[PDB]
Amino acid sequence: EVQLIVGEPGEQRRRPIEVFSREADEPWTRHAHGTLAPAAAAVPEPAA
Amino acid sequence: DLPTYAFEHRHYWLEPADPLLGTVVSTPGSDRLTAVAQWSRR
Amino acid sequence: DLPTYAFEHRHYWLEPADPLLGTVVSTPGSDRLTAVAQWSRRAQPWAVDGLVPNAALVEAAIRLGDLAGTPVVGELVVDAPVVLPRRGSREVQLIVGEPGEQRRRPIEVFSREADEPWTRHAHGTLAPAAAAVPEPAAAGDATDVTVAGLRDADRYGIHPALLDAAVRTVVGDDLLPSVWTGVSLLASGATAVTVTPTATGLRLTDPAGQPVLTVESVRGTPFVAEQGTTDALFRVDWPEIPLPTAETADFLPYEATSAEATLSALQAWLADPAETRLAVVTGDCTEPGAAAIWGLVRSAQSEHPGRIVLADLDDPAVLPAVVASGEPQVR
Amino acid sequence: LHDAGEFDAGFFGISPREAVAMDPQQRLLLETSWEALENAGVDPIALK
Amino acid sequence: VSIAWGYWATVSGMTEHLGDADLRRNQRIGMSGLPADEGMALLDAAIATGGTLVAAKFDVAALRATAKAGGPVPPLLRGLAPL
Amino acid sequence: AVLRGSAVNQDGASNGLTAPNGLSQQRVIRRALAAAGLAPSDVDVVEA
Amino acid sequence: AAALLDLVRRHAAEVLGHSGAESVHSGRTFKDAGFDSLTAVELRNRLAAATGLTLSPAMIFDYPKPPALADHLRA
Numbered sequence A: 001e002v003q004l005i006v007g008e009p010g011e012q013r014r015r016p017i018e019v020f021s022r023e024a025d026e027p028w029t030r031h032a033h034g035t036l037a038p039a040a041a042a043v044p045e046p047a048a
Numbered sequence B: 001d002l003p004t005y006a007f008e009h010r011h012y013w014l015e016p017a018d019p020l021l022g023t024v025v026s027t028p029g030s031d032r033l034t035a036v037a038q039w040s041r042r
Numbered sequence C: 001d002l003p004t005y006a007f008e009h010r011h012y013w014l015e016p017a018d019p020l021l022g023t024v025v026s027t028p029g030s031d032r033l034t035a036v037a038q039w040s041r042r043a044q045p046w047a048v049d050g051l052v053p054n055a056a057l058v059e060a061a062i063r064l065g066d067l068a069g070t071p072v073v074g075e076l077v078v079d080a081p082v083v084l085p086r087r088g089s090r091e092v093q094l095i096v097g098e099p100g101e102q103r104r105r106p107i108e109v110f111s112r113e114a115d116e117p118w119t120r121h122a123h124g125t126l127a128p129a130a131a132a133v134p135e136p137a138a139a140g141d142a143t144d145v146t147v148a149g150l151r152d153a154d155r156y157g158i159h160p161a162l163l164d165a166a167v168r169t170v171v172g173d174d175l176l177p178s179v180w181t182g183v184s185l186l187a188s189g190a191t192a193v194t195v196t197p198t199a200t201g202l203r204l205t206d207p208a209g210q211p212v213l214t215v216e217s218v219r220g221t222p223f224v225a226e227q228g229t230t231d232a233l234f235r236v237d238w239p240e241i242p243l244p245t246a247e248t249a250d251f252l253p254y255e256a257t258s259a260e261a262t263l264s265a266l267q268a269w270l271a272d273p274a275e276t277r278l279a280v281v282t283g284d285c286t287e288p289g290a291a292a293i294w295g296l297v298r299s300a301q302s303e304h305p306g307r308i309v310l311a312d313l314d315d316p317a318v319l320p321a322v323v324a325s326g327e328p329q330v331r
Numbered sequence D: 001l002h003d004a005g006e007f008d009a010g011f012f013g014i015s016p017r018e019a020v021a022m023d024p025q026q027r028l029l030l031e032t033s034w035e036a037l038e039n040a041g042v043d044p045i046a047l048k
Numbered sequence E: 001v002s003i004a005w006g007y008w009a010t011v012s013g014m015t016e017h018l019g020d021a022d023l024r025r026n027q028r029i030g031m032s033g034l035p036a037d038e039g040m041a042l043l044d045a046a047i048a049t050g051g052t053l054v055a056a057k058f059d060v061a062a063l064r065a066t067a068k069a070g071g072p073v074p075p076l077l078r079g080l081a082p083l
Numbered sequence F: 001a002v003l004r005g006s007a008v009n010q011d012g013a014s015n016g017l018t019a020p021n022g023l024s025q026q027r028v029i030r031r032a033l034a035a036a037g038l039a040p041s042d043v044d045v046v047e048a
Numbered sequence G: 001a002a003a004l005l006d007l008v009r010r011h012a013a014e015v016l017g018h019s020g021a022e023s024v025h026s027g028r029t030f031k032d033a034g035f036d037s038l039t040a041v042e043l044r045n046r047l048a049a050a051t052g053l054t055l056s057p058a059m060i061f062d063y064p065k066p067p068a069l070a071d072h073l074r075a
Helices: C054-068 C160-171 C259-271 C288-303 C316-325 D016-021 D024-039 E020-028 E036-049 E060-069 F022-036 G002-016 G037-051 G066-074
Strands: A002-006 A015-021 A033-036 B023-026 B033-037 C023-026 C033-039 C072-077 C090-096 C105-112 C119-127 C143-145 C176-185 C193-197 C202-205 C211-221 C233-235 C252-255 C278-282 C308-312 E052-055
Touching (some): B033 C023, C054 C072, C054 C090, C054 C119, C054 C160, C119 C176, C143 C160, C233 E036, C252 C259, C252 C316, C259 C278, C278 C288
Parallel strands (some): C252 C278, C278 C308
Antiparallel strands (some): A002 B033, A015 A033, B023 B033, C023 C033, C033 C090, C072 C119, C072 C176, C090 C105, C105 C119, C176 C211
C-alpha cells in the first residue's frame, strides 16, 4: 500500500508531498518527500 | 378453443456479482489530499 | 499409407483477468480512520426518494467501530440526513479521530455530491466494547418487525432498513432520530428483530430470544433538507498571470474609441486576406462604451478564435507581450 | 493433452491477432479434419 | 444587479429562433438550459447578492473531461474546467 | 397447417466469414421447391 | 517507391499483430493475409491520416497486391 500525502499549501503555495508505504501492518515507510511549486508563465530551459 | 393454463408468477433472478495515483481523498474542510494506491509487480 | 502434413506450431493463449464501509484508510502515524465509499441509487435500493435513513449511518458507524474495536456508540449527533441524488453518486467520507478519553474515538460523517462543499451528517464518539453492557429497562411490549426484500442482511450487523424500521416504533414515525447514545452490538446478520421499547433507547432481540442489539438512549426530531441551488451564480474574477518576457510579437493594434468604429475595424480585418493578428485596446471594462466594445470583440473572437487579442490596457507598451501571453482576454 | 496451445495460422490464412481470440477447440478441429481428409486419399482442394 | 441569464428552459421571445444546432452548440460550450423555478431562485439569490453575475448551468464534469481529452476550453470557462 | 418440404445448406466460400452469397440462397430455394414437389409459380407470399 | 512499400508493410504488420514488417510478404494478397471489414477500415484511417491524403475505405479489393497499392499512392 503506497500513499501520497499532500498537506495544506505553505510558502509560495508549495504543497508538501510525502510518499509513505507499508505492507499489511508494517510500519509506514516515507520514501520520497518534497514540495510542489506552481508553474511559471515562462520556464527558463537550462543550458545544454 | 379454450384458454390455456394460468401459472402463478414470482420473480427469480441471480445478480452477477490510474494505477500510480489510485484513489484520492479530499479531506472535508481541509486542503490536504491523500492518495492511496496498490502497488504490485503484476 | 503415406505420412501426413508437417505443421508449424506457435503458442497462443489468453489468460483471464461492506458497502457501508467500502474502502478503509489509516492515517500514517495517526489513529484517525477514513472510510471512503460511493453512494448511489443502485448501491442503496432501500434509500427511498434519495433520503438515506440515519439508521444506515448508525450501522455504518457500527461496522467502522467493529473494525476499530469500538462497537459501543458513545455519541452520535445527526447534523442532517443524507439525501442522495437521483442522478449521479455522492462521495461520503467518515473521519474517525484518534481515541481520547476512555479510548473514545471521535467520529464525523462528511458527505459531498461531486463538487458540492463537504457537509457533515453525523458526529459523536465511539466507545470500546465494555465488559458489561446492561440492557435498558423495558417500557413497552416487544413487537416483531419484518422488512420484505432485505438485501445483503448478512453483510451488516443489522440491516439499515431493519434498524430504521426498529427505531420507528420507538422514536416515532413523524420524528427522524437525531442523537444516538449507547449503541452496543450483540449479534450480526439478523434479518427479523423484535423491538422492546425502553424509556429512551430500544432493545433488539432475535425471535429465538438471543439479544442482538441494544440502544441505551435515542431521541428524534423533525427534519428538513436543502440542496445546491445557489451554486449556479458565477462572478467574473480576474486572477493575475505574469506577462511573458517577450519584446516582439505579430499584432495589429487598434485603439478602440467607439463600438461602431470597432465593428468597422473588425469587418475590415475580416476582409483582409493577410493573416495579421488584431488586438483591441479599450478603457476600463466598467465603462459603458468600453464594455460594449469588449462584448463586440468577445463575440468576434467567438466567431474567429485565435485571431483576436482583447486587451484592457493602461500602458500599450505591454501590448505585444499580451499577444504573446496566449490569453485572448487580458486586463 | 498438454500440446493444445500449438496451431498453424499462416496455413489457413489466419492473422496472428485473431488466432489467440479463437477457441483452441476450433483449431484442433480444423487441423484434425484436414488430417482425416488426407488419410482417406481425397484431394482437399478438389472438394470446393 | 445585472444577471447574464442563459438559455431559459422556458421558451421566450428572444429564444424563438434557436434551432437544434443552436442548442447543441450551446451545450457543447457548456451553455445549458435554465429551469423556471431554479431561474426564480437564482433571481432571488442574485438580488440578494447584487452586481454583475451569471446565472447559468455549466456542465463541470463534461467540460473537465473535454479539457483532459484536449478539447478547446474557452478562457472564461477555464476556471470551471481546470487543466 | 401442413409443412410440405424443407432444405438446408451452407453459404460456403464467400467474400468473408459473415458476408452472404446469392447463389447459395438460390440453390437452397430450388432444393426446397424440388423436395416439396411444387413449382415456383405456386407460392403466393414469402416471409423474407 | 521503396519508402511507400516500407511504410505500408510496417502498418500492415502492426495491424495484423505480426512480429515485424518482414513477416508480411509481398506475394500474397491482402485477403490471404487475414484482412476483413474491421481491419481494412481502420488500416485506411491509419494510412490516410499518416500520409495526409483521403481514400475510399475499400483499397484492398481494388488493389489485391501491396505493390499495386503503393503505385496508387504514388500517383
